[PDB]
Amino acid sequence: LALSLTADQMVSALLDAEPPILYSEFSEASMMGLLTNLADRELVHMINWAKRVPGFVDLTLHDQVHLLECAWLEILMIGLVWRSMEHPGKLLFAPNLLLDRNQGKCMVEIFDMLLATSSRFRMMNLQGEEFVCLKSIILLNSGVYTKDHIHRVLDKITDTLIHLMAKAGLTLQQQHQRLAQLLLILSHIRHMSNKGMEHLYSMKCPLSDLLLEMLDA
Amino acid sequence: ALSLTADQMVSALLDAEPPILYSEYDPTRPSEASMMGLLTNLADRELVHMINWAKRVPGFVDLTLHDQVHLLECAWLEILMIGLVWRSMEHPGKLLFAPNLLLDRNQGKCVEGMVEIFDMLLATSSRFRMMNLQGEEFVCLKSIILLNSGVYTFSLEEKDHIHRVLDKITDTLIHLMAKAGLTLQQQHQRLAQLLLILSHIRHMSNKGMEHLYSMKCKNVLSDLLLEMLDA
Amino acid sequence: KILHRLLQD
Amino acid sequence: KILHRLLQD
Numbered sequence A: 001l002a003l004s005l006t007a008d009q010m011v012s013a014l015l016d017a018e019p020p021i022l023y024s025e026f027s028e029a030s031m032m033g034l035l036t037n038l039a040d041r042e043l044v045h046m047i048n049w050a051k052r053v054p055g056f057v058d059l060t061l062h063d064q065v066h067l068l069e070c071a072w073l074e075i076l077m078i079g080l081v082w083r084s085m086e087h088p089g090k091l092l093f094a095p096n097l098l099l100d101r102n103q104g105k106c107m108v109e110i111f112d113m114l115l116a117t118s119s120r121f122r123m124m125n126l127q128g129e130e131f132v133c134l135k136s137i138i139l140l141n142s143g144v145y146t147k148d149h150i151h152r153v154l155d156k157i158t159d160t161l162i163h164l165m166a167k168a169g170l171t172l173q174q175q176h177q178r179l180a181q182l183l184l185i186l187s188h189i190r191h192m193s194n195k196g197m198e199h200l201y202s203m204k205c206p207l208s209d210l211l212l213e214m215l216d217a
Numbered sequence B: 001a002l003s004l005t006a007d008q009m010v011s012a013l014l015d016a017e018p019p020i021l022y023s024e025y026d027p028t029r030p031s032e033a034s035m036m037g038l039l040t041n042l043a044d045r046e047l048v049h050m051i052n053w054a055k056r057v058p059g060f061v062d063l064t065l066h067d068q069v070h071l072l073e074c075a076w077l078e079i080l081m082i083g084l085v086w087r088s089m090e091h092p093g094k095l096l097f098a099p100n101l102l103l104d105r106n107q108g109k110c111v112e113g114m115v116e117i118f119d120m121l122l123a124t125s126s127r128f129r130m131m132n133l134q135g136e137e138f139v140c141l142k143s144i145i146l147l148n149s150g151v152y153t154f155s156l157e158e159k160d161h162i163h164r165v166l167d168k169i170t171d172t173l174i175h176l177m178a179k180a181g182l183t184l185q186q187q188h189q190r191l192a193q194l195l196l197i198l199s200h201i202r203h204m205s206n207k208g209m210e211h212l213y214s215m216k217c218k219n220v221l222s223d224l225l226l227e228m229l230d231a
Numbered sequence C, D: 001k002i003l004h005r006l007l008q009d
C-alpha cells in the first residue's frame, strides 16, 4: 500500500505520525541520567512512529527490529537537530532542557557536530515535510545491507522529496542539487551516530533494559 | 575550477585516476598477522597516490592546506573502500584488494571482527553491480566523498566554495544519466540511490577506524597511516 | 527481547 | 607530519 500513495498523501501520512516532543524531569552523572531517561521514553514513541511509516509494517518482524536497532540513534539526532533549528548555538533536547556548548563538557565533539547540522538545516531552510521524509529514509536505509521492497519505498520518498521542491518553485537544477545536499547530510548523521554509540558503550558498561538492548547490537 | 563543462569534468576526474597497485602477497605461503600486514602495506602505498589524486580534483587545489589535510584524514578510508568496492564490482562474492590479492568471505574470517566489514563491503559491491554503476559516476561519487566527509567540521566562505563544487558534480551526475536515456524521475531516483550508498561507506569507515585502533595498541603499521589514525 | 514486545503492541 | 609534506610537491 506504500507504493500506491500520491506524494501528497505520503506527506500527510508522515506528518500525521510525527512523535510528540517530550519533556525531561549539572554534574556528569545527573546530566547523563536526564538525557538517557529522555531518550528511553522517546524510543517508545519512535517504535510506534516506525510502524506508521508506510511500508515499514509490510516487513518481517526481524527486519523491523534490525532497521530500528541500526538507526534509533540517528532518528533521535535528526529530531534533536530539527527541534534545535531556530535556536542557534543551542540544542533543544526538550522544551525545558536547552543546553549550550559549555554544558557539553559536563561529548563536546558530538555536540558541535549536532550544532553544525542544525546550522545547516537553517542555512538551507529545511521544511518540515522534507524533514519527515529524511527521517523515514534514515529508518529504511541505514540497515538494508545487513530488500527489493525497501528500495521501491526509498525511490518513492525520493519522488515525494522532489515533489515538495517542485511545489515551492525550484528549477530542475535547484531540485536535484538540494536533493543531493539533503542526502549528503545523512552521511554526517550516520557519522555522529557511530561516534555516539562508541561513547555510550564506554560510558555505560544506570541505563534502562530497552536502551541497553539497543546497544547490544 | 567552476567553469568546466560536465563533459570536461568527467575527463579531468578520469585522467586523475590513481593506478591499481599490487601487493607482496605470495600463495606459496598462507597468518592473520601476515594477511593484516599485506592490507596495511597496500593501503599505505595507495595513500601516496590518493594524496596526488586529491590535488587533481576540481576545487580541492583552491582550499587552504589545513583544510586539504582535514578532508583527507577524515575520508582516506572511505576513498580506499569505495575504490576496493569498485575494483570488485564484477567479482561477485570476492573482494579484489589487488590483481593478485583476491579474497573471499572465508578468508576474512581469519582476522577477527572484519567479517562484518567484509560482508558489508561485499554487499556494497553487489549493489554497484545490480545498479550497473558506470566509471563516470564512480569518479564523481569518489570526488563527493573527498569534499563532503569532512566539510561540516570545516573559515566559512571557503566552505561555500566547497558546496558550489559539490553542486556542480551533482549536475555532472545528472548530466551523465540524462545522456544514458533515463527520464527525470529515473535520474532523481538513481541520484538518490547513489548518495545513499555513501551513508554505508561512511558507516564501514567508522567501523574500520574502530578496528584499526584496536590492533594499534595490541600491536598485531606505517607512519603515514598511523598519523591518519591519530587524528 | 524487549523490542519484540513493543513492535507487537 | 607526513600528510603535510606529500601535499606540497
Ligand SMILES: O=S1C(c2ccc(O)cc2Cl)=CC=C1c1ccc(O)cc1Cl
Binding pocket: A035, A036, A038, A039, A042, A076, A077, A079, A080, A093, A107, A110, A195, A196, A197, A199, A200
Ligand atoms: O545525544 S544523546 C541523547 C539524545 C537524547 C534525546 C534525543 O532526542 C536525542 C538524543 Cl541524541 C541520549 C545520550 C546522548 C549522548 C550523551 C553523551 C555522549 O558523549 C554522547 C551521546 Cl550520543
